[PDB]
Design a protein around this nucleic acid. Structure first.
Ligand SMILES: [Zn+2]
Lengths: 52, 52, 122, 50, 133, 84, 88, 97, 50
RNA sequence: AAACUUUCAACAACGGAUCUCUUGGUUCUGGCAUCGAUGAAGAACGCAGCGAAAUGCGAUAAGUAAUGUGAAUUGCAGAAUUCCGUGAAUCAUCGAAUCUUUGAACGCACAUUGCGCCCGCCGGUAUUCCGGCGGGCAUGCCUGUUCGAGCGUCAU
RNA sequence: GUGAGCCCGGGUCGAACGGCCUCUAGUGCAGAUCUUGGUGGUAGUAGCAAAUACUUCAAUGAGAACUUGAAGGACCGAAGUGGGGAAAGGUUCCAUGUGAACAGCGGUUGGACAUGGGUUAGUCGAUCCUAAGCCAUAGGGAAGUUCCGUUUCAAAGGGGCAC
RNA sequence: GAGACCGAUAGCGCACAAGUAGAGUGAUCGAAAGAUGAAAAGCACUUUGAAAAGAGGGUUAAAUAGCACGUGAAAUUGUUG
RNA sequence: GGGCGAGGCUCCUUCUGAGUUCCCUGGAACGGGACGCCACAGAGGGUGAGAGCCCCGUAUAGUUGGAAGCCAAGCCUGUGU
């Protein structure tokens, strides 16, 4: 599906001293919050070059 | 209160002098019906209601 | 006891059905007090009393509606609950007569030159 | 508060009636997967949000 | 090989239908063969099993045990046969579930609905054999 | 309970003057008097006529409000309107 | 004092319960629902929130009348009873 | 010469339904033939000459016969479309051939 | 059967007791990696904490 | 020498990878046209003998009628079914009904289970008082009816 | 076998899998302050030190510093560590019972867990009134969602009498 | 109705009481989580413990399958050599 | 201009072939071996392990019962205001 991996609200936390610059799921109160998104190396992300 | 006293009169031939009502924490209504001094509430509970 | 079948109900009239409904409601009202006072096999009886009350009310409503449909059989305007439901658009649709009405010129042309049955030799 | 509207009290009544553990006979049914009340509420843990 | 477009050979859909079938479908699913004597008497191969039938177990560890059907547990897709039981830890008797396709019916529980079922199945069988012959 | 207001119950609800009855029925005076004679609506006398109408005099005619309500359903009203 | 000390002054309510949609999104001073847009006649929805549309779209609730429509269509919106059926 | 500078992926039309659409068209043709039997499935068309100097060497089927052609053949214009003849009132006969 | 039901009710609590929840109504998911502690830099002007 | 640290092995832990499974997704194809003032979609509150949820349902409330099938349901309890039958069932179908408070939402309102108006019926001593029950009362516009207004144009 | 690897033995295990020739790809990891999950050393370590303070006997109990009764010693010191309310919470209130989990120790105790019970009004509030303010109507804008308007450039209705 | 698609970190966010639990004043954000066994046959009875449990002794084809449950890798740990 | 209409089609309904034969392993044959049978059916699924013949279904013509429509070979009649 063309929307797979992209039905999430996520933004990078920027260059810093602690964590990598992958976009992370915003909000709070759940396990998904702060987790990496949209990447082909990310769990529950979008695959590289999705099949058409 | 008027409906409660009419229903008591229709169901059990019960005459009341006053009826107090409250709404319980679980959402059902509780009614205290004080009977006329001639009748006996213990007799009514023993015979009509079976509350012994 | 406490189980009333619909087969005997379908032959009664309104007065007997109302009288039966009054009895069933009375026994259910007493049986609820007996339930909250003690536990037994009378919970089956309260369940059958509830279903019998439902059956009597259903039969009464059906007989009333049958009588009302017979009363409104030959009338132009009917109650809305007695009118057919279908859908809203189906109700708003043009009737078949109005949809099949044609002009007089079209009727003359169709009368004298309709689509013919024919075959072509090979 | 002690002062409350009827609508608010009705919602509180429904919450009070929902607040319970599951009956123990639920676990003995054929093919049961319910082990506890996963929607159990406590007055110190999660707000009703009214 | 299936031909008709309304027939599906999907394993997923077939297993979903089998394990979520309602009770009236599960009755037909829980069919059992008749014995040789009953087959030659009624011209019927199989029938849905029911409580009160007498069966003989022909598969499993309880083979060659006979008894009346005491329960048709359609929720578990299993029947209970009298004296085909085991002991629990405490020694109390618990029935052992037998699938109906592992038994053979030796004596039918006969009532007029069952005779109607047998008669219409038999009549269909002879009609089909006569038409194909 | 909520406090009742004065003049909202009792004889004020029980009686109606001829003017109020005519305006309630939306009739002319001859039609109203004709209908009252034909249906047996009789004049009534309240104990205190000021409680019913503060401008009422000794020659004010009163009727029962329930009688005028009963007159509202008389089929002769539509006959009057059809003839007009 | 803009953090922990200031959070102690939070005891009012911007939003109450909406009568139409049930959420705690009815602005108590504007009398306008942030979620469904009550008391406007239309239900509030936007194409930039596919998730919010799918949270409240048809089928997410009970479908009390609409779920019976395909069966009535399949049988042709018929009326009456089966021939020889018991009844009045 | 690659025109892929718009959002072209939104408007890609694949044609996996080509055999299914052929089957649907053949079923519709069979239904139309069964409904129209014993009449032919199509209407009679005239012979016309293609326009322009590129294609005027070749003749093909036209839309419908002219009113002058129907008159010279003795077929009335109201009878003609009811016996399988197509009629075109726009076309004229500029030449006798 | 009552003993079996009670044992099943007690055995349903093992994962939540290992997670050390205060009953089944304790379903709080805490922030293990808060953004205010794991993002941004400490500049020379105003800081976010003391 | 032991202990300690490290290395190698066996067993036991920790943890949930691997393998096998799949009533689920994903994509393609084929068929169909059917929401709502005759009150929809959505929301709230309730309903089971023993349920919090999911499911089903609406005070006729895990359901009524009708049709079909033909002996279950099942976790416990309690009852079955005249089994040669107006008939079990958390069955299937579904044309007859019921369908709380709401919501386009419609007497006026609603952060209130607030306040009304009209017409009937019933009950309590009741011409006056009190109570219950039933049916109604939104807006824009169309067609018609009836009641009107204006030296606006006239006739007499 | 140079090698990536291949094959066999032993143990464990429980339902499928492999060789060869072609076809096909979401096909080969040590790194990306990766992604998710799990686990170490640090380490039985840093601490568990504001709010003056605890002690004796008996009972309960498997077990008592933090349970109870009695006996003492102290503190709040009426701008209270007291007696009641508004907001907010929603059963935390009361009785009985209790394994684990929680109460950064301990627990026989508990706002924890389990089963029940508890909130009674003509006179107390709401309900009524208007305040700052907000929204319909007439009417005028605006492609439109809608905007202004709240007394207006509105036929915006009450009463009485009558042979 | 199907597939040279995916096989529980994959495939829809969701194979499960998933747009749920949870978070946010709000608009909105949004998970984790499948598998005992053919059949519960889910351990009678004895014994030690306050209990949880332990040991015998059965059940099973197998408990080297004990509702922490198919298989049970590595990191890391205990004992033994 | 009217009215019949044989017949056909569409949709629900009743019904359909053949091993649980003997031996071995196994807790359980649905495994191995032998002897058969059905097949317009050897698609799929279930049943205590790989089942055409144990069960549901699968193929094919038809065959019970019912309702509403549509098409249609032909056949009766009025005749020109
Ligand atoms: Zn809303």
């Amino acid at each position: 599906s063309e929307k797979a991996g992209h039905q999430t609200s996520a933004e990078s936390w920027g260059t810093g001293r602690a964590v990598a610059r992958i976009p992370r799921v915003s909000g709070g109160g759940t396990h998904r919050a702060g987790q990496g998104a949209f990447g082909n190396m990310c769990r529950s992300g979008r695959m590289f070059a999705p099949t058409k | 209160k008027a409906q409660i006293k009419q229903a008591l009169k229709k169901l059990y031939d019960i005459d009341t002098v006053k009826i107090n009502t409250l709404i319980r924490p679980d959402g059902t209504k509780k009614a205290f019906a004080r009977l006329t001094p001639d009748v006996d509430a213990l007799d009514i509970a023993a015979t009509k209601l079976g509350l012994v | 006891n406490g189980k009333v079948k619909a087969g005997q109900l379908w032959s009664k009239n309104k007065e007997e059905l109302t009288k039966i409904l009054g009895e069933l409601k009375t026994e259910l009202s007493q049986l609820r007090i007996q339930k909250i006072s003690s536990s037994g096999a009378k919970l089956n009886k309260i369940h059958d009393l509830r279903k019998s009350i439902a059956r009597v009310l259903t039969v009464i409503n059906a007989k009333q509606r049958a009588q009302l449909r017979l009363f409104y059989k030959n009338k132009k305007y009917l109650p809305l609950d007695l009118r057919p439901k279908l859908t809203r658009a189906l109700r708003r649709r043009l009737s078949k007569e109005d949809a099949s009405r044609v002009l007089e010129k079209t009727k003359k042309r169709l009368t004298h030159f309709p689509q013919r049955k024919y075959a072509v030799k090979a | 508060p002690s002062h409350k509207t009827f609508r608010i009290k009705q919602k509180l009544a429904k919450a009070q009636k929902q607040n319970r553990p599951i009956p123990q006979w639920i676990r003995l049914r054929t093919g049961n997967t319910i082990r506890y009340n996963a929607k159990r509420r406590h007055w110190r843990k999660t707000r009703l949000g009214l | 090989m299936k031909v008709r477009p309304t027939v599906s050979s999907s394993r997923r859909k077939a297993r979903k239908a089998h394990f979520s079938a309602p009770s009236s479908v599960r009755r037909v699913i829980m069919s059992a063969p008749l014995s040789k004597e009953l087959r030659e008497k009624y011209n019927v191969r199989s029938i849905p099993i029911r409580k009160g039938d007498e069966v003989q177990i022909v598969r499993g560890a309880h083979k060659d045990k006979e008894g009346k059907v005491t329960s048709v547990y359609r929720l578990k897709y299993v029947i209970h046969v009298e004296r085909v039981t085991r002991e629990k830890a405490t020694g109390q008797t618990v029935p052992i579930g037998i699938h109906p396709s592992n038994v053979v019916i030796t004596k039918l529980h006969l009532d007029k609905d069952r005779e109607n079922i047998l008669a219409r199945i038999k009549a269909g069988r002879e009609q089909v054999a006569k038409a194909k012959g | 309970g909520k406090a009742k207001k004065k003049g909202k119950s009792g004889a004020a609800r029980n009686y109606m003057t001829r003017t109020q009855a005519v305006k309630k029925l939306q009739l002319s005076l001859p039609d109203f008097r004709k209908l009252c004679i034909w249906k047996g609506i009789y004049p009534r006398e309240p104990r205190d006529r000021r409680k019913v109408n503060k401008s009422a005099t000794a020659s004010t005619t009163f009727y029962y409000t329930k009688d005028i309500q009963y007159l509202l359903h008389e089929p002769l009203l539509q006959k009057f309107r059809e003839q007009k | 004092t803009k953090g922990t000390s200031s959070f102690g002054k939070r005891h009012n309510k911007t939003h109450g319960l909406c009568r139409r949609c049930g959420r705690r999104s009815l602005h108590n001073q504007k009398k306008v629902c942030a979620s469904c847009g009550y008391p406007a006649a239309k239900t509030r929805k936007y194409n930039w929130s596919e998730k919010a549309k799918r949270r409240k779209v048809t089928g997410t609730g009970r479908m009390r009348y609409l779920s019976t429509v395909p069966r009535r269509f399949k049988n042709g919106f018929r009326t009456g009873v089966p021939k020889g059926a018991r009844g009045p | 010469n690659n025109h892929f500078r718009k959002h072209w992926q939104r408007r890609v039309r694949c044609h996996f339904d080509q055999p299914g659409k052929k089957v649907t068209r053949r079923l519709a043709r069979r239904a139309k033939a069964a409904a129209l039997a014993p009449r032919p499935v199509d209407k009679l068309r005239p012979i016309v000459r293609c326009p322009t100097v590129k294609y005027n060497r070749r003749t093909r089927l036209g839309r419908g016969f002219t009113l002058e052609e129907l008159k010279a053949a003795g077929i009335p214009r109201l009878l003609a479309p009811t016996i399988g003849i197509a009629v075109d009132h726009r076309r004229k006969n500029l030449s006798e051939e | 059967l009552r003993s079996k039901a009670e044992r099943q009710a007690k055995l349903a609590q093992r994962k939540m007791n290992r997670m050390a929840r205060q009953g089944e109504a304790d379903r709080h998911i805490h922030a293990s990696m808060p953004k205010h502690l794991f993002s941004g830099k400490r500049t020379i002007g105003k800081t976010d904490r003391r």
